[PDB]
Every structure is written in C-alpha cells, then in structure tokens.
Symmetry: C2
C-alpha cells in the first residue's frame, strides 16, 4: 500500500489506522505489517515489523532517527503486508508543527586601534 | 569519568578522544567503554558499549533519538570503563549550531458578513 502526501515533511511517527487485524477464524497466527518510509530522493527507510491489534487501533510507529545523520523529508509511506484480510482506513504522517528540521539545517561602527 | 559542560545543549554525538586503548601487553582481550548521557533532570541515557581503537581515534558515538520522544538537554557525560590503562584526553558534546531542538518545541482589518 503506497500512500503519498501533499506536503513532504519529516516523519516523527507514522499513524496507521486499521479496521481489521487480518486474523483468519481458523488460523491462530498473528499478522504483521511492515512500513517503509520513502524520501524525496526515492530511498526506503525500514520501520520494522509490527503486529496488528484492535486495542492499538491507530498504530503508532515511532521513527528512531540518528541525530548525526541528516534529517530527510518524507514523501510516501509503503506498507507491506502478506495477508489479504488486512484493511487500512488511513495512513498519517506525524511532523513537528513549530519547525521543519530539514530546511533549518540549511549594526554600529567598529573601531580597532 | 564524569564530565560536565558549561552550556547544556542537545547531544547529536559524543566525541571521546583517547590516547591509550587500555590493552595490556600480556592480555589479548579488547577494552570497552560505556557512555551514559546525563540530563538536566539527572537521568541516564545509555549509548552502549564501544571498543577502543587507535584507528578510530576521536570515537564519534552517535545518539539515536526517537523522534516521538521529546528532546532533552545534556548536562554531563559519564564514561564507565573497567580497565585502568584507558586514558581520555577530552570528552566533547556535538550539538546543532543553527537551532536548539528542545526550546524550539516550546495585520489588516477582517470583515465578515
């Protein structure tokens, strides 16, 4: 599931809202969702495998970004799952409202004798 | 080794400059250094165990901060090691020069008919 966004911002977290866990009524296995952030430079950043629970309806996936590496804008989110009973109502991107960390990294007379 | 800093800022990375690996001439074991960032609220954040090498002389330790969690100022760095031959010339804190991410998270007439 490839979801695009109008304004490419940083991704503090990815909110994935589901209405089905994907669990079949005859199978006891749990269902996992894998989320890859996509940049404006078309690069995939893995966010890992997460199980699906109705208790965690708006799944919050926290993006752990290394502060030495530069921040990057996020354009698309690819959610990869291997179960056809999984349903997603909407995918959200969480950003910082006060600042954009990507673009932020971009008088009298003085007399000396 | 508890090193304090004058201006508490964020810690993008910790630079630990060494002049000895701590390796004894009769022992083949490597020597590890553990670094804990200390906050202004007096809380320890673990940065892990790192081996000491003369090739990797400045020893840039990156800090992987989860973007959902709030940023915190760093006051002190505690470097814990269990070998008496380890020597440290200086401990540095790497921050963002353009912005402080902690404190950054803190007209005409309109006529309506």
């Amino acid at each position: 599931l490839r979801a695009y966004f109008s304004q490419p911002m940083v991704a503090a977290a990815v909110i994935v809202h589901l209405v089905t866990d994907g669990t079949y009524y005859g199978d006891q296995k749990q269902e996992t969702i894998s989320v890859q952030l996509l940049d404006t430079k078309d690069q995939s950043h893995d966010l890992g495998l997460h199980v699906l629970s109705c208790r965690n309806n708006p799944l919050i996936i926290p993006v752990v970004h290394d502060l030495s590496q530069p921040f990057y804008h996020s354009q698309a989110v690819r959610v990869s799952f291997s179960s056809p009973l999984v349903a997603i109502s909407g995918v959200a991107l969480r950003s910082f409202d006060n600042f954009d960390p990507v673009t932020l990294s971009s008088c009298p007379e003085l007399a000396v004798e």
